[PDB]
Symmetry: C5
Subunit: 376 residues, 5 copies
């Protein structure tokens, strides 16, 4: 993930222009290889047309180049790119939205599962650990970076996400499908045992805990689905054919013909087809957007930081359920205790942001006295 | 389903170009027959124009070809294809999203329905079996592959989804509509009986169970709806007419006229209309996207793997409710038991993914000492 | 509703081409009258230009025809048609999605409302009948076919949706607005009475029942809203003006001018403007999509089958709450009772659908032994 | 709101053509003034060019007119209009969707809040009145028509939405922001008092009541948000500049040049630029769609009928909570009491709508006997 | 936020035209600097071409200008701008939708947490303060204006959002990630303690409180996500390249060539390329829409008023939980106490808004007596 939120906070002079000076996650890094190949091919065709061919071959080539430049079109390619890239971006955001965060569940576990003694600590930590374990199982199923971190279940044991007893239990249950769902069943059964043991005081709390857990299960199922059900291959191939055929046609139809022939549009032979290069930048970069985002769990600069999420979720959830269990800051009267209309101060840098309230669009409507009278 | 997620994890050099080497679920497999017919027709017209016609007939044909190539348009067809294919793809993803998964329900059944004895096993298995049975009833109503697997209710009995007693009960209840809804009523009544019998300890658990079950019912109703309410026939016919009329017009308007006449754009007769073939590939493949996805429960390469889902759901749900009922890995202190800030290690291949946390976009803002002072 | 789901299960050779042989719900049926009028007008203009006009009038007409064909544009019309038809189709699917189905509620009523005696039957049937009654009240408010079936409340009494006592109660409550909301209030009050009478054992069940009922109420409110708040008239008029002005302009600008004048593009006078007819088919059929779907509760071939839904819902809900109340198939061990990994068999026709599980996109990643080592 | 749902129930001959005969909420009413101004300006330019200018000035003007007609473009304007108007229409429908209806809440209040005595009536009426009061407070904040009806809080007292005691309490609580949120806090506190007083029998009913109330609060918050956060001014200005610059350019580039000069496309001087007028109708009406819908709570023909909604909600909610409280039609066996498969009759006008059930797309698949055999 | 809702309530004559007279949040303010730079560059090129170059250099320049104006395209740029700006606007509205409002939670806290004594006040205020504190922590993480107001946690203490004890507790818990989640855990634990202490009477109320709190947590998580996961840099760079390359090409291809050469389209040298300036206004303003909205939490005129929201939420929530706790207006019979059909009056200005109810689209259907008869 390349974050440039702070650079575009305001619409300043050339806001998006400055973003062109970026390399990581940039268009340049994404398409320099394809552009170099296109450059090599274009100048190979130019050299062959300028040296190898005879006069009659050059005339035939010039006719072909005019014919090809007659057949360059930007409406269908831009259309299909817009629709396809829009689909890819929608799925990309949905995939972020199905990343499980344990925060709601961990607040419930910290509150509901009672006991500061060793059994209570053990129970709360085990529950939140089951949630984290299910999350990491699916993430290593779908993310290359997480898989590289945890290439085997033994790695999950060595890294502490899974105890040896849990690993053995998982191996007992093994079915010929991805076993990421198992920690949710474990969570449900341990939660039931906790309620029966008196660690959960009331079944409505159990209901809440299992609701949050199953929300996490649904998010993980959506992650599995996006990993499994690719955007249909035919659609990707269609868009790819459109783009690559455009630029293969440009390989000939954008040649600078011999200036001595004085064809229309070929009066001058500038060596560099700059506008064709700009079209390459546009269209191939537009395609590279989809190429990068189609699988947002790889190792691209702008792919999600899954390993960071895994680490953060483990740290925060364990802290929440263990150290913060019934551990509150002292409750004391706040600064506005007897201030009916609190007005927190502003700094010098923020004073201009003090706004009067918007009361509604109808607030300033002017009505005459007769207009306001209720009729019988 | 053709999964190429792993091939497009990163935006590598020619990522989408390599996908052109695929055959299963490819554009080639989808449109080779239509393309061969188009090839045959185009070259039939060429042969007739080059041999059968007289000089005056050839002049008339050339005028017609110029007139037809005047009338080739790409804006309306690409427009309507974009909108229609977008609708088809939206419905396709929605149809995946309404595939029932028993996982949330099975966690609830494993936790809530008590008793390791034979009656408890029987009850839990029966409940989860009712869920699976309803799912398979709708799926065989909507999916050709599942119907081929279970062409009669007796097949569902022979395959174990339905007991003979359940089959007889279903035949007693028969109405002249699809009876896929019956297992939900059975599930509700059995759940009520379980609560009254003491197998479910508290009515809030019953409420949760029935909520998950009815979520599955709603997903099945949406599956029925997509099966029943087709994309309106007129829309499909409109898009089809646009595409096929484009290429019927190309059958004449893309002929290479006699080079001896020296018409504009016909200076050279290359035998193969390569750019017209590329347009065919684009537009007809774009249409084939909709043709494949419009009914995602058929036997296309990229249709959903419904039979696999049925098998997996049965296996996993039975395991969850029977073998995993109150069967937990031993609860023991985890590796970070007295580690306040756990840091799971990284492998060599994953070490570069260790990221510092993003603290927020405002983190690096610089403010002078005077700027930070609270004003009175 | 015209269902062609089975005809498009696979992307077969000319899948969408075969759909052109349909008449019901087809483009042909939708626009043959408009096309015939357009044909009559076009050939009237041709006849007048070819017979009535003098030479100078013909020259003026030819100049006008060239001027009009200069002003034919496809970008704005296709744009506005795409956006408007997309809006219509979105609303059409939403309107299907707000059709009330009693199935979730009926499962809850069958389970929760206790008593096989006459009072229990009466209570369950009355509750589900109130749900069906509210649904039919809104549907007859919004659907022409349902209104034709039930043109007065007395028709609802004669058809059994409403008892005479209920009809009298409704007449007592009459307000000058649509009274479709009344059965929900009746349902709430009867449910409360049932809970107080001991027929509902616990208030959480009452809560669930009322939640399902109010979901139905919200769907009915959305149906009322779509019936009331039309797509704004100005938008419909804008799209209509675009399409009809295009083809009124074609009435002159697509005339085949006198071939003797040898104008550009008029070298040959083929009698039939076939490409203009294809444009008519495209654009007017595209518009007819919106015309058919804008009100999906009329009598078009592809309008929803509201009367069938009403009948089915009544039959199924009454069966569910009365005959199926605490009426379960015998609970017995299933076929996979002691089979830890059940594998339901496949038929010959379905054996090729047996798939291995997709384990995740990262499953096949190759890592060296050194790469997998955890670093310190 | 202009409802034409009944006029477009079926896709009849010229369905949308007949809608062109409408005046209220029509394109004509929306843009006749702008069109008249455009007419005046165009013919002023024509008169000046035909009378005031000398020969050299006319030649310069003709060159300018050709240059301007070279620069008329329809792709960007139609693009930006499509996207912007689509955004406006999406927000317009969302704003309808956030109109609060008390119906779910009123069913809950009628059922749950017990007591036919004066205190019970008073309590139920007060609760539903608080809901209606909050709704009217936000609506008068956002709707010009409602504000004109209730220009002061004293008007709300005089109209009965607010008692004098409630008005005084509101004045005590006054903060420098819109106080529409206050009735929800009042509702919560009165509901709590009702539960403590025995008027609400069980806290789950209290939970349900407050859930419905807070749903209404969220809808009101969304109404406030749409009122406050306008579509960004720059977007509106961009679309406006595009449209108005198109037609300012048309003011010169669509002049009919002197026919004596025989310029291309100016061979005939028809006095009326009819096609430019049709473009005006299209593009300016398309813009007028956004202009009307951007604030759907004003006084346009197609703005929401907020005052009617306020009146209806008050009437229906008071009836539901007061007259209909525990007031049910007599419960008696229905007409299909001993009819296992009820078939409500059809009228003559509706008999053709009797449909056979759609059993699913797979129903008609043909399989040989060998194909159906389960393999080992 | 620039609110112009009241200015566009009705579709009046030149409604959007009047909006062009705005400066704050206007297109002019957003792009005057870029436009001035473009003006300087264009006229520099004009001056160089008119003075510095020789005759042969001028001929070469004229050929280049014709070549560049051949390569100006509006379809791809408008396409990509439409899609990208649509994405930005969707995310902008979503980001408003994830702004936490405490109103639902504060109603629950005011109702459920009992006790008018000092401990009850302290408890209610502490809970609502925890909600506000979490909200301000995330907002200062994501909003530049809020960060400028609260550049350190000590500022939050000095401003009263955080007590010193809370600040110390936060410093004890510090992890190397954003600690905005901590107040939710505190809220859960304090709520649990309140329930155990008898301040919350029943666990269903606790469940409701924690549900509302966790809704706020999810909204804050979405705010963090939008702050962290920028729209991918490559997409922004692609759109920027398209726009800026268009206008860099215009710098040469829109030059007015020497009128003495009499090139096509260059017959007259008007000094100002007005239409190119209008294209600049359109396209660059369209881009500026995204530039302003891409980060809606900066200091742009149309960015959200986050500081106002913070202040309002604190004031209203403290009032709701402290002063309004069990503080109700006197309950008395309302004005329509014995009025079965209440009709609140209308003012003179609003009388024309009195509407008859829309009864449904089918209301006016005419049926003959024979048509209405039920057939056997
Ligand atoms: C090749 C395709 C187009 C790319 C062209 C790139 C030109 C340079 C952009 C990158 C400069 C980085 C901005 C910067 O580091 O500078 C610092 C300054 C503050 O930021 C600024 O000056 C903001 C400058 C904004 C541009 C001036 C207005 C442009 C108007 C249209 C373009 C035609 C005139 C050049
Ligand atoms: C007919 C319509 C267009 C289709 C043209 C297909 C051309 C060949 C693509 C399929 C090659 C498979 C990739 C491969 O197996 O190779 C291996 C290598 C690693 O992957 C690569 O080399 C990646 C090569 C990426 C292409 C080079 C840049 C293309 C720039 C525009 C095209 C114009 C220049 C050819
Ligand atoms: C007027 C606007 C266009 C409409 C043209 C309609 C032409 C005929 C389509 C309707 C035939 C029904 C299909 C059928 O009953 O036949 C049976 C056969 C199996 O299904 C097939 O043969 C599938 C045939 C698929 C067409 C062959 C490939 C078309 C390639 C582009 C078109 C240019 C070449 C004709
Ligand atoms: Ca901003
Ligand atoms: Ca990637
Ligand atoms: Ca298919
Ligand atoms: Ca219809
Ligand atoms: Ca309005």
């Amino acid at each position: 993930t390349i974050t440039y939120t702070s650079q575009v906070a305001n619409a300043r002079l050339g806001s998006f222009s400055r973003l062109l000076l970026c390399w990581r996650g940039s268009i340049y890094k994404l398409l320099y290889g394809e552009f170099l190949i296109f450059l090599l091919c274009y100048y190979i065709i130019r050299f062959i047309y300028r040296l190898a061919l005879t006069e009659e071959q050059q005339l035939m080539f010039e006719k072909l180049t005019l014919y090809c430049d007659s057949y360059i079109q930007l409406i269908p390619i831009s259309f299909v790119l817009g629709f396809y890239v829009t689909l890819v971006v929608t799925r990309w955001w949905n995939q972020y939205e199905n990343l499980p965060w344990p925060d709601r569940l961990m607040s419930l576990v910290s509150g509901f599962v009672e006991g500061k003694d060793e059994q209570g600590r053990l129970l709360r930590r085990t529950l939140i650990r089951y949630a984290n374990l299910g999350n990491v199982l699916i993430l290593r199923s779908v993310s290359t970076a997480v898989y590289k971190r945890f290439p085997s279940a033994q790695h999950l044991v060595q890294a502490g996400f899974m105890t040896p007893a849990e690993h053995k239990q998982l191996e007992k249950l093994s079915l010929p499908h991805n076993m990421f769902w198992v920690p949710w069943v474990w969570f449900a059964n341990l939660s039931m045992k906790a309620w029966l043991g008196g660690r959960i005081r009331d079944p409505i709390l159990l209901q809440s805990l299992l609701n949050e857990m199953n929300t996490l299960r649904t998010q993980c199922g959506h992650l599995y689905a996006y990993d499994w059900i690719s955007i249909p291959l035919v659609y990707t191939q269609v868009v790819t054919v459109a783009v690559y055929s455009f630029f293969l046609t440009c390989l000939v139809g954008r040649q600078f013909l011999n200036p001595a022939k004085a064809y229309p549009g070929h009066e001058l032979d500038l060596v560099v087809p700059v506008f064709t290069f700009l079209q390459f930048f546009f269209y191939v970069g537009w395609l590279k957007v989809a190429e990068q985002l189609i699988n947002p769990f790889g190792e691209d600069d702008d792919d999600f930081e899954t390993n960071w999420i895994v680490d953060r979720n483990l740290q925060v959830s364990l802290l929440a359920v263990d150290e913060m269990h019934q551990d509150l800051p002292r409750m004391e009267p706040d600064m506005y205790w007897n201030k009916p209309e609190p007005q927190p101060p502003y700094t010098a840098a923020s004073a201009q942001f003090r706004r009067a309230s918007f009361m509604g669009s109808t607030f300033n409507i002017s009505l005459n006295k007769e207009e306001m009278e209720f009729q019988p």
